[PDB]
Design a protein around this ligand. Structure first.
Ligand code: FMN
Ligand code: FMN
Ligand code: 34D
Ligand code: MG
Ligand code: MG
Lengths: 311, 311
């Protein structure tokens, strides 16, 4: 029922983890391989291993989560070697995804060059939206710098590339970004990264709940679904059909999944809910989506993909 | 206990309606005068009467609300005549607030000139953030256009003036806005307006729930409190102390109010929760805040105003 075609590859279902969640180590990644997730993605990496921010840096909230992780990761070479060894095994339906989040333009170009030069045959996600690193202002909110970076990347990177974007809140912003992105042979857009720089407060202790950045953190979960869906939808009606969409934000039930697919997402990523529940989420949410499809008499995602009705 | 000083005026308590909610007509306004609200503000006005967007344009949600009202209002002259008559009566503790949201810069300047020339002795709120007018961006996301408008305004406007701002999501945006705003004799900043251009979907009808703008609308309520607190707090630590703060977003309980005051808000505005509950909300929330204060042994808002603790 959930069979999906994306970036010219076949996946059993559209569900994945969101980058940063359950994908730090090889052991995390193999747990995702073993789960019912249709695909999976690595933790965003930098050239060097990073410890990340001081703890506490992630807190579960009734309506989602807050975090300032600071891009803790085991480094580019570790993920690159894991994905190379795993594509030789031919042990999964569909390629692995590989996230990079360089602390500078030059660092992104350097990682993209190592990926190009390698035998890596899966998909790359360039994170232009990391909101938890104190001194890098979300690059995808800087339309000039975003265009300049992408022009350089496409003079050499021929492999499948998507960009993870932060949320936009203004229709003109969607128009500007779509005109930038539509000029490139991009494989996809992934909307959205966390709602940036929110605050959660413990009113008894009169205090913030994370240590870094005076408690300011990326917000995820049910808080953000309205923004997430809007971002997926707004890009769906503006992007050239060659650029497909991964929908991320607020997905916990099959009904949430259903709503993202109705907006025009082809793959779906689960952050906060996967953090809380672990990889058994995939089996649950697949079954919820299938039941919604069965009640409606739908046998494939194409029956409703992108078919959100206006009034 | 809740006695508050703001813009050199005394109010019995910090609570207000948010503009747009329960303030369209004289009758609405008089209902707010009659309630326990410490103060009240008019519906954002334009030079001409406006019908607003087609219906449905406001929907209650479990986690807040979505709307694309389109600035329906009875016109500038109606609100100006109402407030002029009202200040003559000396029938309330503290001045009325008067919101304007011109469809252009020239319209805002024309209204501010009429206010300046009038005997209006209360407080004006310039809305630089309406996210529901078709074809018209949020001006306060345009830092050059915001600065240029405010420089013109302060060559003539000497009466108390605040600006209603949309939410920002990037620390560098806070710094840029604070350097702009700190160069002016502003009375206040009101953070935040709705989270712009979110989407809500009815999964059974496979449809959006508001008619204008293909269902895209300003998000309010519990969804936005983390953003709203963050914006209140980020401006508190960056604005020169002559510019005070009104906190708006996600206030429904005394605990939500307490959280805003802890961040540094002096007045508090209630939108979505007042829309659902009516003006009886003010009595309830005042009592909830006082009980929180009593449990903590606090006798005045200055015992915790702005005292949010970092880790
Ligand atoms: C623990 C934490 C770490 C994250 N790290 C990354 C990151 O490495 N790179 C990235 O692109 N997104 C990162 N994300 C953002 C998620 O990929 C996702 O966009 C966001 O959490 C919203 O989805 P959700 O509502 O299901 O949580 C992280 C999210 C969280 C919760
Ligand atoms: C029905 C509706 C109409 C609104 N109209 C205005 C408006 O005229 N001017 C304005 O500055 N804000 C307007 N707002 C935004 C609110 O003032 C407020 O900033 C927003 O609702 C967030 O607060 P809340 O979370 O308590 O709803 C409106 C909100 C709603 C719900
Ligand atoms: O369309 C309006 O009247 C309206 C105006 C605002 O400034 C915010 C909002 O959420 C709605
Ligand atoms: Mg599997
Ligand atoms: Mg009263």
């Amino acid at each position: 029922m959930l069979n999906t075609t994306f970036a010219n590859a076949k996946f059993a279902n559209p569900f994945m983890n969101a980058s940063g969640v359950h994908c730090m180590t090889i052991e995390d990644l193999e747990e995702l391989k073993a789960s019912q997730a249709g695909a999976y993605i690595t933790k965003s990496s930098t050239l060097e291993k990073r410890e990340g921010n001081p703890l506490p840096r992630y807190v579960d909230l009734e309506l989602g989560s807050i975090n300032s992780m600071g891009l803790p990761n085991l480094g580019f070479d570790y993920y690159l070697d894991y994905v190379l060894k795993n594509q030789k095994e031919n042990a999964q339906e569909g390629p692995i995804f590989f996230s990079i989040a360089g602390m500078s333009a030059a660092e992104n170009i350097a990682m993209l060059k190592k990926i190009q030069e390698s035998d890596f045959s899966g998909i790359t996600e360039l994170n232009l939206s990391c909101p938890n690193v104190p001194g890098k202002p979300q690059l995808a909110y800087d339309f000039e710098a975003t265009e300049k970076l992408l022009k350089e990347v496409f003079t050499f990177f021929t492999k499948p590339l998507g960009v993870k974007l932060p949320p936009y809140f203004d229709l003109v912003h969607f128009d500007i970004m779509a005109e930038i992105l539509n000029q490139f042979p991009l494989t996809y857009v992934n909307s959205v990264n966390s709602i940036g720089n929110g605050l959660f407060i413990d009113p008894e202790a009169e205090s913030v709940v994370i240590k870094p950045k005076d408690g300011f953190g990326g917000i995820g979960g049910a808080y953000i679904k309205p923004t997430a869906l809007a971002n997926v939808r707004a890009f769906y009606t503006r992007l050239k059909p060659e650029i497909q969409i991964i929908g991320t934000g607020g997905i916990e039930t099959g009904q949430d999944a259903f709503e993202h697919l109705l907006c025009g997402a082809t793959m779906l990523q689960i952050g906060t809910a996967l953090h809380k529940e672990g990889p058994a989420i995939f089996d649950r949410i697949i079954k919820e989506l299938e039941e919604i499809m069965n009640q409606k008499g739908y046998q494939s995602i194409a029956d409703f993909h992108g078919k959100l009705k206006s009034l």
